[PDB]
Amino acid sequence: CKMKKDYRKKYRKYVRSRFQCIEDRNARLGESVSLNKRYTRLRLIKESPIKMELLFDPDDEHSEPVHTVVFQGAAGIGKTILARKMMLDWASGTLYQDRFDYLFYIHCREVSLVTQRSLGDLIMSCCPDPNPPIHKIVRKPSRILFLMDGFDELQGAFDEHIGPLCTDWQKAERGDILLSSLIRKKLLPEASLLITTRPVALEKLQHLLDHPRHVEILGFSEAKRKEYFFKYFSDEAQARAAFSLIQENEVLFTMCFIPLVCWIVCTGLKQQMESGKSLAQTSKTTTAVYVFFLSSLLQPLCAHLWGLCSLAADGIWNQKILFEESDLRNHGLQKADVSAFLRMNLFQKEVDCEKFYSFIHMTFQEFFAAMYYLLEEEKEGRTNVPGSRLKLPSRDVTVLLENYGKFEKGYLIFVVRFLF
């Protein structure tokens, strides 16, 4: 009568078979095996570096299990690879082997938000057997982890404000409600959830989570940087050319270990391509990269650069990396202007246990400080600011140069290089 078999093992085999490669699709050089062993382990940071293991475990206190974890990173990283690889490492018995009996892949590019269905995702992600043991461990929460691959890639309107909680997996409801029900932990309570998404969809996601464990990309590995460049640029010919421009320069690569910086240099290189430039450049030309970056960042604000450039000039002259909100106000860079530049990712709020604002990299602070000396139109808003008169340290390049050989002034070496 009853089939006495360990379906979780059958499922694991299916997953190992289904997710052998990076794509598991044809046209891959004659549909060859991509060999996922080429994957470089991605380093993760708790919003504090963490491993792939202990991802859902309680932290140092409280002993409270983490039901939902959200993964953040730059566009072009290949977030789908992480989602797929995790399931393979699990199916192979190396990742979360003693924590989950099932991992269910949810491909947000396939999921229909309009379509009304029961939680058949548990069935559709199973082996070919049309009648899986949906009422066994496949049903029992706490040993089940769902993987939302590409939350930002869900097709169609999605509302974070939903009346119905769509509980009871056997009841059919709309895909948008169904996904939110899993996210809000109303459907299959105590089940775990892992979400991979671009920053662009976090605003409409956090509302459904309340108290998630947020995770973002230590930084990139050497191989990860390469993959980022090749995926960021949709045109492989430009991907190679853009990569070549940076490939010559070891210094720029080192800073590109930061996911944000890698995005920035790719963005600057992309602007150079779009402009129709000859690419007769050897980037670190750190200036050229940052100039192209700001061109594409600010062109789509630009009249408020003075404020932050003055901020930067103060930063280098007084050896100040961390700025107070008082400084932001004094330099005429406050409220609306600060938010504009934070959205145009260029600044940090030092959310890691600090109350100060800062530049995303020391080279940016130095870069802007150099712009400070060169900035042009004339605006009275820099003198009518409540912090006036400002000490706008000088704008005297001679003084900058005279203090070149002075660690006491923050070296100013890079600042001079940036002026050049």
Binding site: C1, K2, K4, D6, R8, S118, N131, P133, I134, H135, K136, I137, R139, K140, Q170, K171, A172
Partner: protein, 416 residues
């Protein structure tokens, strides 16, 4: 609930009678159809029909409606669900198999009122309690009820129940008392070596009629083989022993073989699957195959036996007193150099019927040789395996040809 007979006066008779009889019949038919239509749907999922019967607390009806449930599979979320299923299951004389998907209840006496019913059924034969939180404290309750003189449960599928060594004591008490239990599956649990030492207390006991025992993936090591070997030697009824997916390496099998080789041993199927065996113990397996004429099925997949292991097994398999019918050799880390020995088995072993060669790099040329020899009046008429094994064109053609030229062969079963 309303369609009933056991009620008083005082305006409880303001309801209809002829119509009440007509509805009773319609409700019965409704249950019959939904009870038989046992599929995933938003119609009454078995237990929902029980809720209906629970309200209609009329044994004359309930015991009749329940005869449409030969196979019951329900999921209990709370106390009310146990009350409902308890009532309906008790009032059922045609159920052969029951599956209880305990949910967020268990490790408690909470379900005692249900297990005490199952043990009084005279028709229930198979009880499936796998894949739920029936931890040791819950197994104790069941074990108390499985000792009932009228239990009649023959097949008890205690799979991933989250059991450990503590339950083995209680299970042994069942084995030493319950003479009806035939098939017991304790796989995918934590019944480590100690659990086996306790379990074997019942297995070696008189009146223990257990025939099939699964101890697959129970965190066992070779240390437990000393007790399992004793069971194989003494047990009058144990014929099916599955102990794969464990740390019962070569040194463990040698122990089991020392007793399993005894010609008076009743062992028929030996599931030494992913036991981590090497060619080292194949001489022990060979001895068993040669001497134990009761051994008909041997499953060695997952064991990196290699070509040396095959050669050693052949010494036993080709022996005139070997009666092995089914040999499974899937991921056994075999290569083309063993094809001469496998080929020998294909035509020289007159007892062998099935040979499940599988996920190993055997070589397509080796397989073509098998085709040529099988045609020479081979008795190996069952599935030849060779699954997940890929071949060139000429080899695939040879295999297809074999099936056509040797129609008495059940199947090759190529992957593509």
């Amino acid at each position: 609930g309303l369609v009933n007979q056991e009620r008083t006066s005082y305006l409880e008779k303001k309801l209809s009678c002829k119509i009440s009889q007509q509805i009773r019949l319609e409700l019965l038919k409704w249950i019959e159809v939904k009870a038989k239509a046992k599929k995933l749907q938003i119609q009454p999922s078995q237990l929902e029909l029980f809720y209906c019967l629970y309200e209609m607390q009329e044994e004359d009806f309930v015991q009749r409606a329940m005869d449409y449930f030969p196979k019951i599979e329900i999921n209990l979320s709370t106390r009310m669900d146990h009350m409902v299923s308890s009532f309906c299951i008790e009032n059922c004389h045609r159920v052969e198999s029951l599956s209880l998907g305990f949910l967020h209840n268990l490790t408690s006496s909470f379900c005692r009122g249900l297990f005490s019913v199952l043990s009084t059924s005279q028709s229930l034969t198979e009880l499936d309690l796998s894949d739920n939180s029936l931890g040791d404290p819950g197994m104790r309750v069941l074990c108390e009820t499985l000792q009932h003189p009228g239990c009649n449960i023959r097949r008890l599928w205690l799979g991933r129940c989250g059991l450990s060594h503590e339950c083995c004591f209680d299970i042994s008490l069942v084995l030493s008392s319950n003479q009806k239990l035939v098939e017991l599956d304790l796989s995918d649990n934590a019944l480590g070596d100690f659990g086996i030492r306790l379990l074997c207390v019942g297995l070696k006991h008189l009146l223990c009629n257990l025939k099939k025992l699964w101890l697959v993936s129970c965190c066992l090591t070779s240390a437990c083989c000393q007790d399992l070997a004793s069971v194989l030697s003494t047990s009058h009824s144990l014929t099916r022993l599955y102990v794969g997916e464990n740390a019962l390496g070569d040194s463990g099998v040698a122990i089991l073989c020392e007793k399993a080789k005894n010609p008076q041993c009743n062992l028929q199927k030996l599931g030494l699957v992913n036991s981590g065996l090497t060619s080292v113990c194949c001489s022990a397996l060979s001895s068993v195959l040669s001497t134990n004429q009761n051994l008909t099925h041997l499953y060695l997949r997952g064991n990196t036996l290699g070509d040396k292991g095959i050669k050693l097994l052949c010494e036993g398999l080709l022996h005139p007193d070997c009666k092995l019918q089914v040999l499974e050799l899937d991921n056994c880390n075999l290569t083309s150099h063993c094809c001469w020995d496998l080929s020998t088995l294909l035509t020289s072993s007159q007892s062998l019927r099935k040979l499940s060669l599988g996920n190993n790099d055997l070589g397509d040329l080796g397989v073509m040789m098998f085709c040529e020899v099988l045609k020479q009046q081979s008795c190996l008429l069952q599935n030849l395996g060779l699954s997940e094994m890929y071949f060139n064109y000429e080899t695939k053609s040879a295999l297809e040809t074999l099936q056509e030229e040797k129609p008495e062969l059940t199947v090759v079963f190529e992957p593509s």
